[PDB]
């Protein structure tokens, strides 16, 4: 591929390793092309930290010059990632905290202790499904049987999504994230999702229960608008499911391909927690985060982000930052000193509110899985597991394993 001064993000994810390296090498700020739409990617750790706390970078899609001019529209296949309703996700400034506070309180380590038994129950249930599927030495998909359902069950328990509605949510999410979904069908799926959660908030308003959705509705003043409640709810369920599936799967893939490091955690010399942090740094759930806009020109010394320009946080490239992590940043090493120094959960006001929950689900699921099936191994070379065509998320397709004897 000849030299180009715009890096085109391939939506088929045919060369993630190469693209990620190009992005680091072109950085820490470089021009990218997202399905025919230009933007700047932040690929460097220190610069990312700076800009994530910069008040001249906002989520508001109306601050985007290409949106103002109608150059980008709802026909853009990535538009569902950013042209969404009011929530903690889209708001900046003094109003932002109000939209976050009930959620961060509900998701503190101490509050999550109450959720621990529930997580344990689902993990045990799905390991049981794994046993059944892997009987008589059969090949089994670790994603569909285990990693894919677990975080949906867990986030659904927290928010009050009924057992019987969870399959439909997963079907919608799959359509929503796949670049291949026809755009008209995707926009219809976006409407259906919104319709589902509108009704859920109406149901919880009539009949509140012991769940975060009910706590968002009834605080602990001033009360959240209906739109705000629905917006927070959609963001929490989608993010809580999609990111966490990836982290479970990549952590297993990492440890299975680095058996000496798997041994370290199994024998209690390094914490599972630490293996999870290194996974987040090295092969984490987010590839790119769309998208922020300059309210005015931002001067970075030898470079200017012009007012109205789109800014993407390229979190995977940032995790491979050689300046911060040393020359071997492209290796998985749970013993490295900077394993916990990533910003894969973000930085600043929009930092992930669910990081503790994510960490807890992984810290329960991973040891449970390897203790239950100590001889678990790939039935297909790990390096041949392809990514699903989902541009922004590190979404693995399937994960064939044998339980082992
Ligand atoms: C498990 C792995 C996870 C990773 C790698 C992850 C990563 C992130 C990152 C990087 C952001 C901020 C993007 C930015 O502003 O630049 C974020 C925001 C958010 N995340 Fe997490 N997340 C994870 C799990 C979760 C979970 C479990 C939940 C909910 C329970 C969640 C809910 C949210 C919400 C609602 C936001 C928007 C916050 C705001 O904009 O103020 N994510 N996620
Ligand atoms: C970083 C990440 O992967 C998560 C954190 C916040 C999440 C977004 C928060 C809210 C929404 C709206 C929802 O209807 C569609 C998914 C979408 C657009 C999420 C996509 C995945 C995101 C971006
Ligand atoms: K909208
Ligand atoms: Mg050039």
37 Ramachandran zone, left/alpha/beta (phi>0; psi -120 to 50) = beta
- How far is residue 110 from each of residues 54, 243, 262, measured CA to CA in Å? 31, 22, 28
174 secondary structure, DSSP code = H
Biggest alpha carbon–alpha carbon distance for the chain: 63
Ligand nearest to the CA of 48: 1
Beta bridge partners of 127: none
- Contact between 226 and 265 (Cβ < 8 Å): no
Rounded CA gap, 202 and 89, in Å?
Answer: 21
Rounded CA gap, 380 and 114, in Å?
Answer: 38
Nearest CA to ligand 1 atom 7: 345
Sign of CA dihedral 274, 275, 279, 281: positive
Cβ-based burial of 21 (10 A; exposed 0-12, middle 13-18, buried ≥19): middle
Ligand 2 pocket test, pick from 81, 169, 287 with the greatest ligand atom count within 8 Å of Cβ, gives 81
Helix ranges restricted to H, 284-386: 315-319, 322-325, 355-372
Cβ-based burial of 136 (10 A; exposed 0-12, middle 13-18, buried ≥19): exposed
CA of 238 to the centre of ligand 2 (A): 6
Q: In 10 A of CB 306, how many CB atoms?
A: 11
Rounded CA gap, 19 and 13, in Å?
Answer: 9
CA of 240 to the centre of ligand 2 (A): 9
- How far is residue 395 from each of residues 93, 109, 249, 284, 388, measured CA to CA in Å? 32, 27, 9, 10, 6
- Domain extent for 310: 1-405
Q: In 10 A of CB 327, how many CB atoms?
A: 7
Q: In 10 A of CB 53, how many CB atoms?
A: 11
Rounded CA gap, 177 and 192, in Å?
Answer: 15
Atom of ligand 1 nearest to the CA of 88: 41
Rounded CA gap, 92 and 105, in Å?
Answer: 19
Cβ-based burial of 219 (10 A; exposed 0-12, middle 13-18, buried ≥19): exposed
Query: Residue 274: which residues within 8 A CB-CB, separation 6 or more?
Result: 265, 334, 339, 340
Rounded CA gap, 231 and 234, in Å?
Answer: 5
- Contact between 370 and 259 (Cβ < 8 Å): no
Q: Residues within the annotated binding site for heme b?
A: 96, 100, 292, 315, 350, 352
Nearest CA to ligand 2 atom 7: 239
Rounded CA gap, 161 and 167, in Å?
Answer: 11
Rounded CA gap, 108 and 290, in Å?
Answer: 26
Sign of CA dihedral 107, 113, 116, 117: negative
Nearest CA to ligand 2 atom 14: 234
**CATH code at position 203:** 1.10.630.10
CA of 105 to the centre of ligand 2 (A): 20
Query: Residue 235: which residues within 8 A CB-CB, separation 6 or more?
Result: 84, 87, 88, 89
Sign of CA dihedral 305, 285, 330, 327: positive
Ligand nearest to the CA of 284: 1
Query: Residue 193: which residues within 8 A CB-CB, separation 6 or more?
Result: 169, 172, 176, 234
Buried b vs exposed e over 265-286: b needs ≥16 C-beta within 10 Å? bbeeebebbbbbbbbbbbbbbb
CA of 282 to the centre of ligand 4 (A): 28
Q: Is the peptide bond before 355 cis (omega within 30 degrees of 0)?
A: no
CA of 373 to the centre of ligand 1 (A): 30
DSSP string computed for 130-142: HHHHTGGG--EEH
Rounded CA gap, 133 and 216, in Å?
Answer: 39
Q: In 10 A of CB 323, how many CB atoms?
A: 11
Ligand nearest to the CA of 107: 1
Rounded CA gap, 169 and 138, in Å?
Answer: 29
Q: Residues within the annotated binding site?
A: 3, 5, 96, 100, 292, 315, 350, 352
The number of domains in the chain is 1
Q: What is the dihedral of CA 197, 199, 204, 210, to 10 degrees?
A: -30
Structure token pair of residue 370: 């390897």
Structure token pair of residue 136: 């008589």
Pairing of strands 289-294, 298-299: unpaired
Structure token pair of residue 41: 């990617």
Structure token pair of residue 366: 């991973």
Buried b vs exposed e over 77-115: b needs ≥16 C-beta within 10 Å? bbbbbbbbbbbbbbbbeeebeebbebbeebbeeeebeeb
Report phi then psi at 306, rounded to 5.
-70, 145
Query: Residue 32: which residues within 8 A CB-CB, separation 6 or more?
Result: 6, 7, 8, 9, 23, 38, 39, 40, 41, 312, 314
- Contact between 284 and 342 (Cβ < 8 Å): yes
């Amino acid at each position: 591929c000849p030299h180009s001064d715009t890096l085109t993000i391939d939506p088929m994810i045919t060369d993630l390793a190469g693209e990620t390296s190009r992005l680091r090498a072109a950085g820490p700020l470089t021009r990218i092309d997202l399905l025919g739409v230009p933007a700047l990617a932040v690929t460097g750790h220190t610069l990312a930290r700076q800009l994530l706390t910069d008040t001249r970078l906002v989520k508001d899609i109306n601050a985007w010059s290409l949106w103002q001019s109608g150059t980008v529209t709802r026909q853009w296949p990535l538009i569902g990632m950013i042209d969404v309703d009011r929530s903690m996700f889209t708001v900046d400034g003094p109003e932002h905290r109000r939209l976050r506070i009930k959620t961060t309180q509900a998701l503190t380590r101490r509050r999550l202790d109450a959720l621990k038994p529930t997580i344990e129950r689902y993990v045990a249930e799905l390991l049981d499904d794994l046993e059944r599927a892997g009987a008589d030495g059969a090949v089994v998909d670790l994603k569909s049987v285990f990693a894919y359902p677990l975080p949906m069950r867990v986030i659904s328990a927290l928010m009050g999504v009924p057992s019987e509605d969870q399959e439909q949510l997963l079907t919608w999410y799959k359509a929503f994230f796949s670049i291949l979904t026809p755009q008209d069908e995707r926009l219809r799926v976006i409407d259906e999702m919104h319709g589902y959660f509108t009704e859920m908030v109406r149901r919880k308003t009539a009949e509140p229960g012991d769940d975060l959705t009910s706590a968002l509705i009834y605080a602990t003043e001033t009360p959240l608008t209906e739109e705000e409640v629905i917006g927070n709810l959609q963001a929490l369920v989608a993010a809580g499911h999609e990111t966490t599936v990836s982290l479970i799967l990549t952590a297993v893939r990492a440890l299975l391909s680095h058996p000496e490091q798997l041994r370290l955690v199994r024998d209690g010399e390094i914490g599972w927690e630490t293996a999870i942090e290194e996974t987040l740094r090295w092969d984490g759930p987010v590839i790119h985060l769309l998208m922020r806009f300059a309210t005015e020109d931002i001067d970075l010394g030898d470079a200017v982000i012009p007012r109205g320009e789109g800014v993407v946080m390229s979190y995977r490239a940032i995790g491979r930052d050689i300046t911060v992590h040393g020359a071997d940043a492209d290796d998985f090493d749970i013993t490295r000193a900077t394993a916990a120094r990533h910003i894969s959960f973000g930085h600043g006001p929009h930092i992930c509110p669910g990081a503790a929950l994510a960490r807890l689900e992984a810290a329960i699921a991973l040891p449970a899985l390897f203790t239950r099936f100590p001889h678990l191994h790939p039935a297909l070379p790990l390096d041949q597991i392809p990514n699903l065509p989902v541009l922004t998320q590190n979404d693995l397709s399937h994960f064939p394993i044998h339980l082992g004897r």
